[PDB]
Input
Amino acid sequence: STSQVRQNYHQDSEAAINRQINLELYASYVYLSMSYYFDRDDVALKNFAKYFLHQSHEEREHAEKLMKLQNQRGGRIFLQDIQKPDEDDWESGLNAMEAALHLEKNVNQSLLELHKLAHDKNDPHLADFIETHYLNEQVKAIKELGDHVTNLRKMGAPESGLAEYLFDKHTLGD
Amino acid sequence: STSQVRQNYHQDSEAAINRQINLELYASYVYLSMSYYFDRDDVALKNFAKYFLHQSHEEREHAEKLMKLQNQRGGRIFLQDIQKPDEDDWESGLNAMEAALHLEKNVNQSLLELHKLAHDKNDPHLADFIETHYLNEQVKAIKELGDHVTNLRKMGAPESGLAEYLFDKHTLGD
Amino acid sequence: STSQVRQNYHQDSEAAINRQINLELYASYVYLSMSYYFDRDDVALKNFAKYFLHQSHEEREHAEKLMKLQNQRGGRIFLQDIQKPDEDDWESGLNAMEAALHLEKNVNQSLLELHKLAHDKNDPHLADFIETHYLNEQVKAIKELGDHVTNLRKMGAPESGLAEYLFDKHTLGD
Amino acid sequence: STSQVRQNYHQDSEAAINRQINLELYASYVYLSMSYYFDRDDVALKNFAKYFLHQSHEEREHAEKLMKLQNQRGGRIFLQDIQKPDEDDWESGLNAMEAALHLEKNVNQSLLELHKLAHDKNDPHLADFIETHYLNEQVKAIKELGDHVTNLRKMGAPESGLAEYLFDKHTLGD
Amino acid sequence: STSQVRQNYHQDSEAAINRQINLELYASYVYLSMSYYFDRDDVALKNFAKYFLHQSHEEREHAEKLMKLQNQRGGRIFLQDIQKPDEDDWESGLNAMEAALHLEKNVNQSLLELHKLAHDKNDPHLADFIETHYLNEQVKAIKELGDHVTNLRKMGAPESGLAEYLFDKHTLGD
Amino acid sequence: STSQVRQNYHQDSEAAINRQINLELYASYVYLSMSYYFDRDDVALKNFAKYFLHQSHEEREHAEKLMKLQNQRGGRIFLQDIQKPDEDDWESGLNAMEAALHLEKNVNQSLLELHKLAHDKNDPHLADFIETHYLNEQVKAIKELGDHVTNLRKMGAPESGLAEYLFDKHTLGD
Ligand SMILES: O=C(NO)c1cccc(C(=O)NO)c1
Ligand code: NA
Ligand code: NI
Ligand code: NI
Ligand code: NI
Ligand code: NI
Ligand code: NI
Ligand code: NI
Ligand code: NI
Ligand code: NI
Ligand code: NI
Ligand code: NI
Ligand code: NI
Output
């Protein structure tokens, strides 16, 4: 039955929100995984570790914000298993940043579709929500991961252990 | 003829804005009536009274900024009578909360139609204005009014005079 | 059913307070209309606009204190339509000052009749309420508007656009 | 191979830790779900929502500290799917508290087994890690949940909606 | 080649940002020119000069944020000559204000066309970027220049040198 | 005809100043281009980017000071097109530094000629202006650009991607 607050909220929108929530939780799990990889005693890049833990916590916020949205519009929250990440070993700082970059473009793609749907269903409140809270966040995150990938490459990563050490100190360590 | 500032601002949009101003002033008036209803010596719920007086002054502000937008775009303000509310006696705390929820959804619907007009006339400025200053304010009012209605019901209102009293104290009073 | 608080409160008085409520709300509306007339890109006198918006919120307070009075004596508030103002275009700073003067003398005339009624019904609390919160406010307001009208006339308004500009800057702007 | 730091760390412990990590993430997920149940417009108990959201974030911390422990001892983290919680709809404040109480005792169960493993493998660093950061935390949580359940039942929950409202305000609302 | 960050960014959009970049710099150049026209000893209106120098620096910021956008989305900046302004002598305060109004309406028109392109290529990030940072800024700037034009005209500009002097003091000089 | 302030100010000097204004605007433009080159996701050297953006805003100040000197002496400002820079793509940190040095030596050459023109025309006011505000600024910039080029070379640039990264961090990052 229909929530007392529901208005102009398409059940397709509601289902897409539930999928986005699962995708943000998944992204935060991937970042959690990347963070404790660089915490390993045989990798030991503390700033990669805390860079990725920070992203892990932001993705958890992203998801909670979609959960609040769902309830605000009178949709109903249906959670699904959070799939484990594709890797347990992320190989290098470089490779981790690249996998993060790919992850973010896939999150961005699902959000752009969410936005298209909201536009298509004449749900301007939801479109504006995706614009305000998610779209520029992806663009900034993707632009930053590219910069990082670019620098690690020009420095000689992953072959230069020096390059990853120094990028950990001078870029990811403030 | 036309204002020196007018640009990409359709006369249909100008008319809808004059319509929305009136509806916002109307909403203010309803909330004013509600507020002083709970100020009656035979109703005597100060925090209900305070809550709707606050929404009354908010709606007045909603109206004033639509008047500002009107002049900004070079449209022209035509005011209309402000219609008296549907009731002089709002019956109870629960009933007033329910009428308020109904009122906001009707205002929300008016705003969503205004937004699709702005997008049909390819007026991205007007569309963003509505997104930015109205759409999420309506979603929040509607979700809050929903929450209040739910709690007042679960508590035993409107039959239970104890329920409305305790809601007035513990939810609407800080 | 007579209110448990009602005492020495005549229904003529009760009815006349409801009329005065409506009249203050009307005065508020007129002032609102004048304010955004001067916000127009082709009128553009910011301190005229500010001045009348201030008067508008004052009149709203005037109306709210009368609704409070009604409930304090155990009368019952009945709201009526709020008529739109007489003009959509107010022509000039001078002309709006003069309509304000005339509006304020009309509200004063109604308040003097309200007070006459309270005294004829031996209602000294009501007469003192009107004396304390309304009569000198009107006299001050009428005196200020006449001062403003007088200076605008001597400066050459409304034919001198220079005059209305300089008045807006030096008298209505701090 | 074998990590340069590994010392007295049995592969059964390492694998028991990996399973605990998953169980803490699971517990986090359950609490997240409970939290936004109470945020629904038709449930609308915001301090229940606040309380479970805070437990959710605490369990994510339990999980991260185990991931740290694993790396400290030279184990290797292997994450698994995080299973979706057993309900989408938690029925009431009282039922949520009872479910949470059941969840915490099960987590307590797995930790005391984790701990008896550590004593048996003569891993005293691991046993005190469990003693110090988990065992008393679980006892406090189980006791607090017991107290809440006890109080909700005496107040008349889950049938008395008044009871859950007042418990939300006077216990969970600080 | 395609940038590693590019996603949902159409080459027409990329091309149109490059044009908008050039147009803002052009606008900044026009304002620079207007500003030092009022610095001339035979014009000598220092608040006119400060007013246009300020808009000049704002327009340069408009251009720089567009260059930032281009790189954020993976586009490539291509700069073009900056055309000199249409006049070397701007004639009067009023005439400069009117040229500024027409300039800002042209930049607005190009910005609306940029936004419609973003909408048509389903590029919600770019459209939101234009909504957020440019469209209301244009509307405010157009509205203000219109106000200034109106006040200069009512005061007797540009024949009244007294008028432009008094307007420079009381409106543009804080 | 002649400005009422003009004195000992040769028409050739007035024209040379108009030329120098353009060249300063040109220098500004080159540095702006360089700046956002290093802001590209595939270049990604923020301190290079910030460094040239700073020089860009300084050149703009250099230009405006000359526009002010022009009016101070009763000459008349004539703006010309600002020519786009010679490159859209500046290749590397070392190459941009070398271009910048070349640009500055060319600007210095223009200024030294402007100075000798001033001394040939017996304009001690113009000659001291160039001395006081440009000549040593040019020498300091040329010396500093020289120092940067030397270090990037000794470090292994532009081959070494590590070189430019470490320089960006330790020299241009304070
Ligand atoms: O310490 C123990 N319980 O407290 C314990 C448990 C299992 C085995 C052994 C053992 O091998 N003793 O020799 C000891
Ligand atoms: Na928007
Ligand atoms: Ni995200
Ligand atoms: Ni409203
Ligand atoms: Ni209480
Ligand atoms: Ni009044
Ligand atoms: Ni008498
Ligand atoms: Ni735990
Ligand atoms: Ni033992
Ligand atoms: Ni601009
Ligand atoms: Ni569309
Ligand atoms: Ni220079
Ligand atoms: Ni270093």
